[PDB]
Design a protein around this nucleic acid. Structure first.
Lengths: 52, 49, 98, 79, 98, 79, 52
DNA sequence: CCCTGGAGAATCCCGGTGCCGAGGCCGCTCAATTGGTCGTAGACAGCTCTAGCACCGCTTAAACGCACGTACGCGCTGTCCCCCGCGTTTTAACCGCCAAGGGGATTACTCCCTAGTCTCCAGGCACGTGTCAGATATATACATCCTGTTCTAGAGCGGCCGCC
DNA sequence: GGCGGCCGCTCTAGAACAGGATGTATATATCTGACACGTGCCTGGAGACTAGGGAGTAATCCCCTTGGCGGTTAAAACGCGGGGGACAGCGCGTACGTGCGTTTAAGCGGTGCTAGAGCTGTCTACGACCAATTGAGCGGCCTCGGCACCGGGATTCTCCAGGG
């Protein structure tokens, strides 16, 4: 989460950072696959054929 | 024994017609010839026609 | 003179990028809160919900619908499409077990 | 309270699909998504109703909502 | 001339036959030795009971049958009748496996 | 013990899909089906390995497989 | 299960009948949705477009 | 029809405000910590004996492989109607402010019923066994599916008739 | 006398229908193997009893969600333009359905050995519980600074128009 907070140049850990930390790690993603994180959103990814 | 032996036009008869179901066999004893398997099953049935 | 006239799809992709990195609740508070009360009133009348209780219901429902929409969207490319369908949701719920 | 299923507006369903990375949204998606949300809400709130009724309480707390979501494999963090 | 069943008629007949009969589709020993080589990576000195392999085999097939049902439904969803590996990958992703 | 992933033969995978109602089977399905079977087996059997190791036993029982499948929401009846 | 056994002209309950009984009934199907039944198979249903 | 230059608009980097939620401090009090003491679950040692591991005949249904063709995945085209981008005007969403009164939370008294034993006995389990429904087996019989032949409708052609 | 129009004739093909084929639906014959009934225990629940402790109930309280107001500006909704995509349709081909030859190992039955899981003692440290205690977690209060907000500016990516 601190690495994600440093990615978007933020000092304070916000729930978006915790959600980004959980989903990015494949070990944390499978461990928390059935886990909903409030105020976290999802991973900002776009499908290959959906790109212009 | 063999691979072609029938009284009528042979269809690769074992001693059984290969490529066909088991309920098509006849094991009667008649005059059986080969003739190069009726000249390659009647030259591929006149070329499919 | 000529209007900008953005083609369909490009602004939708921009809305995807602006909302995937966002954090705020997309569904409005009172319309979702009023929907909770009418659903609960069929089960039990004279029932109240806390403000954080409705807030907890709102984020869970959005994330469940977002995760459903990702399965809905991924089925579209699987079906050689870019537009989601009502049958796309029905396939997603059936595979998920719902 | 009637016709509150339309509170989840068409842009609201559109915005939810934008968070999921949906390129295009059909016109029949909104009615189906409202029905899916109604079914999902009818299960979580009913489970929270039994949780609230078991505690001899008349107001549903956020903690009971967490237990209602946790028992179906959809646990929520942060309440 | 041979009867020459059209493609799909015998496949449907196997569908009718295997959906009412509870015989075990995968053979015992080829599935049994697969368990031993998989468990060899975790424990070299390990044994398996006859019912232990039996319990693993029915669970694996029912998971595979349920996966094939979701894979098949994705094919008709994608205007197809032939199951595809990308249909399997969509099934695991929607179910949350992979 | 090597090349035992081929023990799940092509008609055996074919019989599985016929039980699932599949009409037509692609030629690349069998390799993919073997992969998802290997992944599923590598989770349940490994879970049963930890169950057997904790039980101070060197032989995996069907009872340990029951809890191994149950903890992943795949409980099996009849053991 | 007894009704399914009578439909199959059987007077003994077999695991196929139990699987048919569970999956046919809607509340039993959802309750035991995450439940595997051995020696039971699945329901003998075919999709509409798969028919000749 | 495709490549490249210029400009419209939503997005990104940056300076200044500040504020309100986060970081730090004070008690202090209630839950974490120290020592002792037993009932007791558990690690350890020996027996065993019932089920799994390894190899062997065999035979036979299951499985690899090759020949063939037709349902079907996939490539390509149009369209049109279904969905998006944007201008306008309502609209109810969010926020500022106010009481309310059911209701969550806390404290206390007390009273039922559940913790914990004694004894026993009648339902529940291991063992033994006659038995009655299921499976194997096979001629018989369904049973639908595939295919061949015939029936009837449709379009094309040619002969005949009337008109200029 | 030439030619357009009309009707009859033969060709062709779609489709309903009947017959053959092969894998299953049943009618016994008989095996057979677990099913359930009977028996003999016997080991865990039940009647009865003792004691105590956690919740039902009553009271309080303060607190927090509902109703209820408007302001306002963000946004839903309506509609117009239009534009790119879902799908009907068509064509290619390949690659997977169907079928048996051949092979090869699945599985049934058999035999032998031992890896080791219950089973029974044994003895032993270990954790719940009881006095006794004590020290930083948390409610609350003081302080403070990171990023929301508000603009300002800008690179910077993107679309429309012009040229080859």
């Amino acid at each position: 989460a601190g690495n994600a907070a440093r990615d978007n140049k933020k000092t304070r850990i916000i729930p978006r950072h915790l959600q980004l930390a959980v989903r990015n790690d494949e070990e944390l993603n499978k461990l928390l696959g059935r886990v909903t994180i409030a105020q976290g959103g999802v991973l900002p990814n776009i499908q290959s054929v959906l790109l212009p | 024994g063999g691979r072609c032996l029938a009284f009528h036009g042979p269809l690769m008869y074992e001693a059984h017609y290969q490529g066909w179901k088991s309920s098509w066999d006849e094991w009667v004893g008649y005059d059986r010839i080969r003739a190069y398997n009726e000249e390659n099953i009647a030259m591929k049935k006149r070329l499919a026609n | 003179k000529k209007p900008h006239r953005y083609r369909p799809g490009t602004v939708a992709l921009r809305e995807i990028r602006r909302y995937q990195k966002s954090t705020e609740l997309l569904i409005r508070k009172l319309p979702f809160q009023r929907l909770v009360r009418e659903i609960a009133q069929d089960f039990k009348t004279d029932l109240r919900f806390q403000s954080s209780a409705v807030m907890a219901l709102q984020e869970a429902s959005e994330a469940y619908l977002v995760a459903l929409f990702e399965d809905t969207n991924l089925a579209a490319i699987h079906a050689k499409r870019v537009t989601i369908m009502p049958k796309d949701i029905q396939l997603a719920r059936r595979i998920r077990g719902e | 309270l009637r016709d509150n299923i339309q509170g989840i507006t068409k842009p609201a369903i559109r915005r939810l699909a934008r968070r999921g990375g949906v390129k295009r949204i059909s016109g029949l998606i909104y009615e189906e998504t409202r029905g899916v949300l109604k079914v999902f809400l009818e299960n979580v709130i009913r489970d929270a109703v039994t949780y609230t009724e078991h505690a001899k309480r008349k107001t549903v707390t956020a903690m009971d909502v967490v237990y209602a979501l946790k028992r179906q494999g959809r646990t929520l963090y942060g309440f």
